[PDB]
Amino acid sequence: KKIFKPEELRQALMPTLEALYRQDPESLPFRQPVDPQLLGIPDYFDIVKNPMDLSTIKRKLDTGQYQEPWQYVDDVWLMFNNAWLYNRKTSRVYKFCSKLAEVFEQEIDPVMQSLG
Numbered sequence: 001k002k003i004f005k006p007e008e009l010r011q012a013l014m015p016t017l018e019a020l021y022r023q024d025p026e027s028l029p030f031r032q033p034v035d036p037q038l039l040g041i042p043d044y045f046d047i048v049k050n051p052m053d054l055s056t057i058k059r060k061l062d063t064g065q066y067q068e069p070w071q072y073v074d075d076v077w078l079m080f081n082n083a084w085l086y087n088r089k090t091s092r093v094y095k096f097c098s099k100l101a102e103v104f105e106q107e108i109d110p111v112m113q114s115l116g
């Protein structure tokens with residue numbers, strides 16, 4: 001049973017998160033937690049029960065909250081699923097989410113092979 005050290009996870013997985021941050025404009029809606037009052041979308045927390053964003057994932061990596069790589073992947077996918085659930089298919093946020101999911105799939109695969 002492989003035990004992953006926090007710095008091993010940070011060194012392997014942080015570059016995949018940085019690849020999402022580097023997408024501009026597509027990462028802009030995801031860099032900070034959704035603020036429904038500021039954005040004028042007060043129904044947000046009625047629809048999205050478990051919010052997630054890039055800055056929260058980065059903090060979890062920096063503070064050793066993930067014991068296994070799949071837990072990090074689950075949080076990235078939670079962020080994507082929240083955006084596809086909440087936003088309309090024609091919206092900027094939905095299409096930007098779809099682009100981030102393509103980028104993430106490409107970056108995470110070789111990294112998971114290396115962590116095996």
Ligand SMILES: CCOc1ccc(C(C)=O)cc1-c1cccc(N2CCCC(F)(F)C2)c1
Binds near residue numbers: 030083
């Ligand atoms: C359109 C209502 O804002 C949102 C709705 C939903 C969600 C989620 C993640 O479900 C996010 C945002 C959000 C948050 C910050 C910035 C931005 N943007 C600023 C730059 C231009 C832009 F990238 F197109 C959009 C969008």
